[PDB]
Design a protein around this ligand. Structure first.
Ligand SMILES: O=C(NO)c1cc2c3ccccc3n(Cc3ccc(F)cc3)c2cn1
Ligand SMILES: O=C(NO)c1cc2c3ccccc3n(Cc3ccc(F)cc3)c2cn1
Ligand SMILES: [Mg+2]
Ligand SMILES: [Mg+2]
Ligand SMILES: [Mg+2]
Ligand SMILES: [Mg+2]
Ligand SMILES: [N+]
Ligand SMILES: [N+]
Ligand SMILES: [Zn+2]
Ligand SMILES: [Zn+2]
Lengths: 184, 368, 368, 184
DNA sequence: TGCGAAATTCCATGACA
DNA sequence: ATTGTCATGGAATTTCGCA
DNA sequence: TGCGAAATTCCATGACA
DNA sequence: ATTGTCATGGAATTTCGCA
């Protein structure tokens, strides 16, 4: 079997609902399977429509051979299937209630959820503007298993924004109570 | 003047006036019998005035002015006095064209890495499409990989919105642009500093300098044109298609597509190259690093037979940018302060401000 | 198609398919093991479709299209099928630029006599001066002698008023103009016929053809500019001065002023040449006739290394005159009917009308 | 003494008042002394002003060394003198009541008066339009004394409008009575 | 029958949008 | 059925003044 | 060890206003 | 303180298939 490559597989999923930011509520998350590279797209809904609009941007840069998702309504619609067929993209679904990715991708998705949460608290409404920096962080984050960041694996070069501080990512005692005040 | 001519009339030799012709008085004026005929020798004190009258009839250059003077007069080294005046005629100096070409162009080194340098620029206005009139074009210098964003105006604000999206992917060391309003605003300066991006600007009114992106503009417009033949010019929905189409197109001299130069492997697009299927990603990136260094680089062409190259201290004139009708095409002479490279200079513009300027927007002031 | 490939798989030799490579079946497709890798050999009946898909991604030319195909496929003489499609892509044909230069320019003979040929043309619009916006410029071909008339519009009616005044002096055999509205109107046609004047027209959108007068426009504007430096652009009162100034200016290559070529003697203007003072008028006109015949005439320059020259029956394309944004720069192919001279042709424009056209507004249709 | 040349001398004079044509009343007549070449200019008055305007046109083509005139008010004004001085033109006047030109010029002026009269009758009001053709006639008219037309002497070439019909120039019996009807 | 310097000629360059 | 042109100012070449 | 034809490379041309 | 570029399709040159 041939070695794993970038564009072999994109793992997609939604995150939200979130607090409104510039009128957006969700985040489509795309992670390349081989590199761990992450693209984020703000949507107004987890619909087929919003997914198609967002992936249209991404797929005008690179097209994946296979997209992997859970059985979210947006991903199992025949519209979304029609869309993928047009681009020669094979669709792939995890079985219901049993999501499987790969270690790399599961770990990556965890970082994303946690990183978002950390930065949303204090400014739960200003996250739209923060998406670019969130991505650069995730993509210039060192992979313990491989010797390299997703940036390095995607482009074959060091980045001009190396994130030297392997960060806390954990909620400080202040932020813990600040988050228990926003929910109330 | 009158002393020179006096000593002349009595047959004494004066330096400049050949001894073999006969010089005489007639009608109260010193004359001489030269092969072509009899000419008046005016006193030196009259000569500047004469050259000036001859020149001013039609503001003529060297020979056309001389030919008028030679009709009536003769003196030693006429053209030397003609040229003296040509170099002092403010009107000729700023109105005439140059007859000396720029030195041969520079071919700057290709950026070493993707994201080392972006070249950005606007295209438009275009026929309105979904209320959009311009396209922001961003070209990575090393790869040629290009991003396209439709905008309503070539504004800083639309530039910033688009680049925030782009730089989600990676942040470049340098962004190179022309001196458009969009890119020279202090709002854009701040946006760049905030991210550790260095702003580099073309000399004014010299699009060659953004050649990388200008040239990409051509392909973009050309492909849009073909796709729009016999349909209305709805280009908005085609930008994404054009972007993808061009990033995946071979450059015959390089034998690579910009996508390949950026990622070292084709994505799932038609006719994807399969050559590295058996390499590991790491082996693939290794062959990529090697491909990127060995790419064809063109060299500086031969100078044309009558080119000029700038020298510190030279009097030179900057081209007027947007000259009004019936107004001069050149500014007043100014001085070459520093020679940044053979095609770029700093001049002091008689005001005097320092300006960094392409030699293509300069002529060397004539007659010293 | 399938027969060819069948006979191939069992080791029989087919013309085109080199015998030394191994051809096999796999995944239901005929393959071959070539130095660069394993490629699919599609059946001939599939090949046109493939070339078309490759070409249509970015509407690429020969090599850029080939490089996509070679990624997946191999067959005999691939580029031959690529080129076949390039010559049938209406969109590429009318959108692409030419990469072949026009043949070297003609240098028509100087008219033999003053008044044999006029070249006329308008300059403007200019800043309003006394309510005037244009200048009618009339240049006698042989002498360069020029007349200037200020007008409010480049109209037939203002042309006729001015020429009625001019032709009070003499009537020319021929008037040469471009295809401006002013000169192509039937009112102007009648005005000419009435006087036995023959109208000659430039090919469309080719000002080189009125080069004689276009060039005179330059001197006129240039002298007006100099005279107007640091004053408001009141050019109306300067036309008479400019006219006189230029008619009395030497051409350094000829060594004569247009006035001299017209009259064979200077009028009472500054620096009047006195050389023929002792000749009779008749002796003077005799030396004039001789001066007029021996004037320097330039010759046709060398062709550039990649020029084309028109041949009867050639497919060629006319340049679109005023192409809209994002619209093709070329018309559909058309046929060279007659080759009037090496730089001028009659084409049949697929409608089809006869058009007389400069080769500068033509490209030879690519790929035959 | 050096031979006579074109531009050596221009003989000028006015003709009129005439019947209004396009609002014009007079004709300034300019005849080159050596060639017999004639330029005509329609004016509204025999003033210094109208003379200056008209000669400004002519002198933007060729400047004469000397202008010759009778002692008409327009020609003896110090304005007209100032004008000539600016162009380095020497002014020359015939003595009052005793006009002298030269045979060639006297003969030429006679032709002009007669030619005008002939063509004005029947159309006394349409003469403005006829000035161009009048001039071509006069200038392509053969000089018995010299072998050549003024056109030929000015330009050193044949003309594209040779006036082959040496014309009547005399009033036909019809025109004689038509003229005795216009005066009444 | 030759030298140095002046005069003349040559001609690439750019502009008539 | 029509077609480039020519001012310009350094450089190249030729001619001049003298011997 | 050399031939004819195909493949590849070279590169003038023009256009990003 | 900055700097031309590169698709294109005939022609030139090189390589291939075969001997
Ligand atoms: O981006 C721009 N301004 O902000 C800009 C301005 C010009 C321009 C101005 C005048 C004439 C032509 C011009 N081109 C075409 C071009 C492009 C590249 C070259 F090398 C030469 C010409 C431009 C392109 N872009
Ligand atoms: O008279 C005219 N129309 O009626 C006209 C039209 C153009 C024109 C159009 C487009 C670009 C340049 C143009 N030029 C300058 C020019 C002049 C002479 C040349 F050889 C080359 C260019 C023109 C002059 N006159
Ligand atoms: Mg720009
Ligand atoms: Mg641009
Ligand atoms: Mg015109
Ligand atoms: Mg014109
Ligand atoms: N460089
Ligand atoms: N000719
Ligand atoms: Zn001047
Ligand atoms: Zn095409």
């Amino acid at each position: 079997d041939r070695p794993q490559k970038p564009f072999d597989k994109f793992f997609i999923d939604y995150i939200g609902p979130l607090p409104p930011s510039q009128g957006y509520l969700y985040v489509l998350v795309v992670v390349d399977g081989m590199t761990g590279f992450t693209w984020l797209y703000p949507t107004k809904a987890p619909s087929t429509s919003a997914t198609v609009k967002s992936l249209n941007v991404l797929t005008s840069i690179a097209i994946p051979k296979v997209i992997h998702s859970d059985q979210g309504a947006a991903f199992t619609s025949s519209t979304f299937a029609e869309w993928a067929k047009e681009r020669g993209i094979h669709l792939e679904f995890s079985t219901p209630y049993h999501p499987q990715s790969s270690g790399k991708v599961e770990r990556k998705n965890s970082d994303i959820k946690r990183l978002l949460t950390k930065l949303l608290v204090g400014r739960p409404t200003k996250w739209y503007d923060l998406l670019p920096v969130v991505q650069l962080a995730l993509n210039n984050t060192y992979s313990p298993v491989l010797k390299y960041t997703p940036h390095q694996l995607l482009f074959g070069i060091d980045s001009n924004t190396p994130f030297a501080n392997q960060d806390t990512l954990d909620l400080t005692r202040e932020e813990e109570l600040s988050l228990l005040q926003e929910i109330r | 003047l009158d002393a020179e001519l006096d000593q002349l009339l009595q047959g004494h030799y004066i330096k400049g006036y050949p001894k073999q012709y006969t010089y005489f008085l007639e009608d109260g004026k010193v004359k001489v019998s030269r092969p072509e005929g009899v000419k008046i020798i005016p006193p030196q004190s009259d000569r500047q005035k004469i050259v000036l009258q001859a020149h001013n009839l039609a503001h003529t250059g060297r020979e056309a002015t001389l030919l008028k003077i030679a009709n009536l007069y003769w003196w030693p080294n006429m053209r030397k006095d003609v040229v003296k005046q040509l170099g002092r005629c403010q009107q000729c100096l700023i109105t005439n064209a140059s007859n000396k070409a720029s030195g041969p162009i520079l071919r700057p080194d290709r950026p070493q890495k993707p994201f080392d340098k972006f070249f950005i620029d606007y295209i438009g206005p275009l026929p309105p499409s979904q209320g959009y009139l311009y396209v922001l074009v961003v070209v990575d210098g090393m790869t040629g990989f290009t991003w396209l964003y439709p905008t309503k105006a070539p504004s800083t604000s639309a530039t910033v919105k688009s680049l925030n999206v782009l730089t989600s992917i990676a942040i470049p060391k340098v962004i190179h642009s022309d001196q458009g309003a969009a890119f020279t605003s202090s709002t854009f300066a701040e946006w760049a500093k905030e991210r550790g991006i260095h702003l580099e600007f073309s000399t004014p009114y010299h699009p060659q300098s953004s050649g990388k992106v200008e040239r990409k503009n051509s392909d973009i417009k050309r492909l849009l044109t073909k796709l729009l033949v016999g349909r209305p010019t709805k280009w908005y929905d085609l930008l994404p298609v054009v972007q993808l189409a061009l990033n995946n197109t071979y450059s015959p001299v390089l034998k690579y597509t910009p996508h390949q130069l950026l990622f070292g492997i084709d994505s799932n697009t038609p006719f994807a190259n399969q050559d590295t299927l058996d390499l590991t990603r790491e082996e693939e990136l290794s062959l990529l690093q090697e491909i990127r260094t060995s790419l064809y680089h063109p060299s500086t062409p031969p100078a044309s037979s009558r080119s000029w190259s700038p020298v510190v201290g030279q009097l030179v004139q900057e081209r007027v940018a947007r000259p009004a009708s019936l107004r001069p095409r050149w500014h007043k002479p100014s001085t070459v302060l520093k020679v940044l490279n053979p095609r770029t200079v700093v001049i002091l513009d008689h005001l005097g401000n320092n300006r960094t300027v392409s030699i293509d927007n300069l002529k060397p002031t004539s007659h010293q």
